[PDB]
Design an enzyme around this catalytic site. Structure first.
Site, PDB file in Angstrom:
ATOM      1  N   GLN A   2      36.698  38.206  43.376  1.00 49.46           N
ATOM      2  CA  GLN A   2      36.357  39.048  42.181  1.00 49.46           C
ATOM      3  C   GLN A   2      34.823  39.047  42.081  1.00 49.46           C
ATOM      4  O   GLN A   2      34.160  38.014  42.178  1.00 49.46           O
ATOM      5  CB  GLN A   2      37.095  38.542  40.966  1.00 49.46           C
ATOM      6  CG  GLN A   2      36.714  39.222  39.626  1.00 49.46           C
ATOM      7  CD  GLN A   2      37.624  38.686  38.535  1.00 49.46           C
ATOM      8  OE1 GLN A   2      38.718  39.221  38.431  1.00 49.46           O
ATOM      9  NE2 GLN A   2      37.164  37.687  37.815  1.00 49.46           N
ATOM     10  N   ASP A  32      41.929  59.462  27.309  1.00 48.11           N
ATOM     11  CA  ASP A  32      41.182  59.978  28.507  1.00 48.11           C
ATOM     12  C   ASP A  32      42.210  60.685  29.423  1.00 48.11           C
ATOM     13  O   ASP A  32      43.129  61.326  28.964  1.00 48.11           O
ATOM     14  CB  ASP A  32      40.507  58.709  29.182  1.00 48.11           C
ATOM     15  CG  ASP A  32      39.240  59.078  29.929  1.00 48.11           C
ATOM     16  OD1 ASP A  32      39.203  59.960  30.781  1.00 48.11           O
ATOM     17  OD2 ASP A  32      38.220  58.504  29.464  1.00 48.11           O
ATOM     18  N   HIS A  64      38.717  59.293  35.873  1.00 48.66           N
ATOM     19  CA  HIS A  64      37.921  58.868  34.730  1.00 48.66           C
ATOM     20  C   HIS A  64      38.544  57.826  33.846  1.00 48.66           C
ATOM     21  O   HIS A  64      37.937  56.750  33.612  1.00 48.66           O
ATOM     22  CB  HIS A  64      37.313  60.040  33.976  1.00 48.66           C
ATOM     23  CG  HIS A  64      36.319  60.922  34.667  1.00 48.66           C
ATOM     24  ND1 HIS A  64      35.953  62.118  34.065  1.00 48.66           N
ATOM     25  CD2 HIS A  64      35.840  61.033  35.941  1.00 48.66           C
ATOM     26  CE1 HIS A  64      35.144  62.782  34.868  1.00 48.66           C
ATOM     27  NE2 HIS A  64      35.049  62.118  36.005  1.00 48.66           N
ATOM     28  N   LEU A  75      41.531  42.914  35.166  1.00 49.77           N
ATOM     29  CA  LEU A  75      42.073  41.566  35.064  1.00 49.77           C
ATOM     30  C   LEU A  75      41.188  40.460  35.618  1.00 49.77           C
ATOM     31  O   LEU A  75      40.515  40.702  36.650  1.00 49.77           O
ATOM     32  CB  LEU A  75      43.463  41.590  35.727  1.00 49.77           C
ATOM     33  CG  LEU A  75      44.593  42.407  35.137  1.00 49.77           C
ATOM     34  CD1 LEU A  75      45.763  42.422  36.122  1.00 49.77           C
ATOM     35  CD2 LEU A  75      45.082  41.903  33.771  1.00 49.77           C
ATOM     36  N   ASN A  77      41.138  37.576  37.694  1.00 52.99           N
ATOM     37  CA  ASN A  77      41.973  37.056  38.856  1.00 52.99           C
ATOM     38  C   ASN A  77      41.040  36.872  40.043  1.00 52.99           C
ATOM     39  O   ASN A  77      39.801  36.681  39.936  1.00 52.99           O
ATOM     40  CB  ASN A  77      43.140  38.095  39.033  1.00 52.99           C
ATOM     41  CG  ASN A  77      42.725  39.544  39.335  1.00 52.99           C
ATOM     42  OD1 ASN A  77      41.497  39.780  39.595  1.00 52.99           O
ATOM     43  ND2 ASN A  77      43.637  40.464  39.095  1.00 52.99           N
ATOM     44  N   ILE A  79      40.544  39.188  42.543  1.00 56.57           N
ATOM     45  CA  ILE A  79      40.332  40.492  43.141  1.00 56.57           C
ATOM     46  C   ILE A  79      39.431  41.368  42.264  1.00 56.57           C
ATOM     47  O   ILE A  79      39.375  41.192  41.039  1.00 56.57           O
ATOM     48  CB  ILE A  79      41.692  41.201  43.569  1.00 56.57           C
ATOM     49  CG1 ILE A  79      42.574  41.605  42.370  1.00 56.57           C
ATOM     50  CG2 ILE A  79      42.507  40.304  44.589  1.00 56.57           C
ATOM     51  CD1 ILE A  79      43.562  42.757  42.519  1.00 56.57           C
ATOM     52  N   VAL A  81      37.281  43.627  40.063  1.00 58.42           N
ATOM     53  CA  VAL A  81      36.214  43.470  39.015  1.00 58.42           C
ATOM     54  C   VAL A  81      36.788  42.644  37.871  1.00 58.42           C
ATOM     55  O   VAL A  81      37.871  42.050  37.917  1.00 58.42           O
ATOM     56  CB  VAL A  81      35.567  44.844  38.693  1.00 58.42           C
ATOM     57  CG1 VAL A  81      34.835  45.480  39.925  1.00 58.42           C
ATOM     58  CG2 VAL A  81      36.509  45.869  38.081  1.00 58.42           C
ATOM     59  N   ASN A 155      26.187  63.190  27.386  1.00 58.59           N
ATOM     60  CA  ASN A 155      25.234  63.137  28.535  1.00 58.59           C
ATOM     61  C   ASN A 155      24.332  64.381  28.556  1.00 58.59           C
ATOM     62  O   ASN A 155      23.955  64.908  29.616  1.00 58.59           O
ATOM     63  CB  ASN A 155      26.027  62.989  29.861  1.00 58.59           C
ATOM     64  CG  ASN A 155      26.958  61.775  29.938  1.00 58.59           C
ATOM     65  OD1 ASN A 155      26.697  60.741  29.374  1.00 58.59           O
ATOM     66  ND2 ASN A 155      28.057  62.107  30.612  1.00 58.59           N
ATOM     67  N   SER A 221      30.198  57.874  29.123  1.00 57.80           N
ATOM     68  CA  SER A 221      31.613  57.491  29.209  1.00 57.80           C
ATOM     69  C   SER A 221      31.818  56.099  29.760  1.00 57.80           C
ATOM     70  O   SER A 221      32.896  55.532  29.548  1.00 57.80           O
ATOM     71  CB  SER A 221      32.235  58.543  30.065  1.00 57.80           C
ATOM     72  OG  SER A 221      32.695  59.696  29.480  1.00 57.80           O
TER      73      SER A 221
HETATM   74 CA   LIG Z   1      39.872  41.280  38.746  1.00 60.15          CA
END
Ligand SMILES: [Ca+2]
Ligand code: NA
Length: 275
Positions: A2, A32, A64, A75, A77, A79, A81, A155, A221
């Protein structure tokens, strides 16, 4: 392995995760393009589609909504992000099609769904140049109902002396979020005006994309979900606080950055706001 996107660290979210506050039991609606519920780095608790053409909120044709969702709650964990509020209950409220275009009626229906479904926080990483009395009444209703409403400021950059904050960000009941980079500099695209409230990281934000992918985007966003995630962390520490108290906490504890027409109150600091 991660990785923690810089924007999560910038707002001081890891200080709350270190204390054991991760957004558990807080209901966040991502209004969204839908959320890819199959992504290994997300858990989607529920949702609804407001697009009469596309019934499934759990398919994101645009990308998006999945990217926004990963900033709120990717999450914790081994992996991908890490989101701001990795334990928050994410809800996919699809209001925009594969094109990224929606109807104001669809948006309003999505707000109404979020009120009826007792969402704690709404994120709207959307905006247009034109408002409506029905749009204002929906955001106002959500606020009066106890929801924290956060939206991208837009934006549009600068336009002389005019406010360029889009709707619904322009309404006083909404927290309108502008974008800074990693150096606390306002991004040139970030909309300006008296209605801008706070800033969050919005340049080169790495998050989840549909089909087990990750990518970086720019925009207000991307700044918005940092603030929606921050409100979920605050509620996880202080479940008895009202939306009024969550908003005030975030606005009053910012790092001041520059002129309020450009920067609002400054950069959010979740560690200070979570008090
Ligand atoms: Ca993660
Ligand atoms: Na506002």
């Amino acid at each position: 392995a991660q990785s923690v996107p810089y924007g999560v660290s910038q707002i001081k979210a890891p200080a709350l995760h270190s204390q054991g506050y991760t957004g558990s039991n807080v209901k966040v609606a991502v209004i969204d393009s839908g959320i890819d519920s199959s992504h290994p780095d997300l858990k989607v608790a529920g949702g609804a589609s407001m697009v009469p053409s596309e019934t499934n909120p759990f398919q994101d044709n645009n990308s998006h909504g999945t990217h926004v969702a990963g900033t709120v709650a990717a999450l914790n964990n081994s992996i991908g992000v890490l989101g701001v509020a990795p334990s928050a209950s994410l809800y996919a409220v699809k209001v925009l099609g594969a094109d990224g275009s929606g109807q104001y009626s669809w948006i309003i229906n999505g707000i109404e769904w979020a009120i009826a479904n007792n969402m704690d926080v709404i994120n709207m990483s959307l905006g247009g140049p034109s408002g409506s009395a029905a749009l204002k009444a929906a955001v106002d209703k959500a606020v009066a109902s106890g929801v924290v409403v956060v939206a991208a400021a837009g934006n549009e950059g600068t336009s002389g002396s005019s406010s360029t904050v889009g709707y619904p960000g322009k309404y006083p009941s909404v927290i309108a979020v502008g974008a800074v980079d990693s150096s606390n500099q306002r991004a040139s695209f970030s909309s300006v005006g008296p209605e801008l409230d706070v800033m969050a990281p919005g340049v080169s934000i790495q998050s989840t994309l549909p089909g087990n992918k990750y990518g970086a985007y720019n925009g207000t966003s991307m700044a918005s979900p940092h603030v929606a995630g921050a409100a979920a962390l605050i509620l996880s520490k202080h479940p008895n606080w009202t939306n009024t108290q969550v908003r005030s906490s975030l606005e009053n504890t910012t790092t001041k950055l520059g002129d309020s027409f450009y920067y609002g109150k400054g950069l959010i600091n979740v560690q200070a706001a979570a008090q």
